[PDB]
Scaffold this motif. Structure first.
Motif, PDB file in Angstrom:
ATOM      1  N   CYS A   1       2.342  -6.241   4.181  1.00 56.04           N
ATOM      2  CA  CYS A   1       1.171  -5.390   4.372  1.00 56.04           C
ATOM      3  C   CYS A   1       0.105  -6.244   5.033  1.00 56.04           C
ATOM      4  N   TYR A   2      -0.804  -5.602   5.761  1.00 60.10           N
ATOM      5  CA  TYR A   2      -2.002  -6.267   6.249  1.00 60.10           C
ATOM      6  C   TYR A   2      -2.977  -6.478   5.088  1.00 60.10           C
TER       7      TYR A   2
ATOM      8  N   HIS B   1       3.028   1.594   3.325  1.00 60.75           N
ATOM      9  CA  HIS B   1       4.084   0.621   3.593  1.00 60.75           C
ATOM     10  C   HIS B   1       5.214   0.633   2.563  1.00 60.75           C
TER      11      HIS B   1
ATOM     12  N   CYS C   1       0.819  -1.205   0.000  1.00 66.44           N
ATOM     13  CA  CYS C   1       0.000   0.000   0.000  1.00 66.44           C
ATOM     14  C   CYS C   1       0.856   1.260   0.000  1.00 66.44           C
TER      15      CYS C   1
ATOM     16  N   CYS D   1      -4.907  -3.292   4.442  1.00 70.27           N
ATOM     17  CA  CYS D   1      -4.234  -2.035   4.110  1.00 70.27           C
ATOM     18  C   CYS D   1      -4.956  -1.215   3.042  1.00 70.27           C
TER      19      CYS D   1
HETATM   20 ZN   LIG Z   1       0.262  -1.707   3.950  1.00 72.95          ZN
END
Ligand SMILES: [Zn+2]
Ligand SMILES: CCN(CC)C1CCN(Cc2cc(C#CCNC(=O)OC(C)(C)C)cc(I)c2O)CC1
Length: 196
Positions: free
Chosen positions: A143-144, A84, A81, A147
């Protein structure tokens, strides 16, 4: 275009394996066989085992790539994202845009595909440590799933391919991934939803 996710053991009987890490709230990486789904915390070590029935040639490599699981998103490149990709958390090898890293392998290589623009990370295929029956690669997801401006809550698949030295297909396996704060709870929840 969308890379194939077809399971293919090939001539060497290639397949993945996962540890049995359980679902305690403290767990940082855990795999659900029932869901074929890895649940992990951000940037934590994810052990993935490589199993074969016979030794592949020297120069064989192992590549990891992420794609969106849902039909309507499969054609979009999976990337980190906008936050990040800019947090200066590079290990010196991984481009900061790449979702998937290999941890602790100086021979890891990172590819930006010149035609599909998809990202991948590839390492040499090596025999197990003396006394072991399989080889383990340690992956990080950067990343989650949640995100914003990146995966944005869309489920992904990791596709692992066994390749010859030219990049030709020798084998393929895959698993879904959720990167989240509490993998133990989420695996319990999703397994219960499946049971319903
Ligand atoms: Zn992220
Ligand atoms: C039935 C299965 N079983 C029976 C005893 C065998 C156990 C011993 N393994 C050896 C083995 C080699 C590799 C490799 C490689 C690249 N070539 C490479 O390094 O080539 C050499 C070693 C010739 C230099 C990757 C993996 I994961 C792996 O398990 C094969 C399976």
């Amino acid at each position: 275009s969308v890379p194939s996710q077809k399971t293919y053991q090939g001539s060497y009987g290639f397949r993945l394996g996962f540890l049995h890490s359980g679902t305690a709230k403290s767990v940082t990486c855990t795999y659900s066989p029932a869901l074929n789904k890895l649940f992990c915390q951000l940037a934590k070590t994810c052990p993935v085992q490589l199993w074969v029935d016979s030794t592949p040639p020297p120069g064989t490599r192992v590549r990891a790539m992420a794609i969106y699981k849902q039909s309507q998103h499969m054609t979009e490149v999976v990337r980190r994202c906008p936050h990040h990709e800019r947090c200066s958390d590079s290990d010196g090898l991984a481009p900061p845009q790449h979702l998937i890293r290999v941890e602790g392998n100086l021979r890891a290589e990172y590819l930006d595909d010149r035609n599909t623009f998809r990202h991948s990370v590839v390492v040499p295929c090596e025999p197990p440590e003396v006394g072991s029956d399989c080889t383990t690669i340690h992956y990080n997801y950067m990343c989650y799933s949640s995100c914003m401006g990146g995966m944005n809550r869309r489920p992904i698949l990791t596709i692992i391919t066994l390749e010859d030295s030219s990049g030709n297909l020798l084998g393929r396996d895959s698993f879904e991934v959720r990167v989240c704060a509490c993998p133990g709870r989420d695996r319990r929840t999703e397994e219960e939803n499946l049971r319903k």
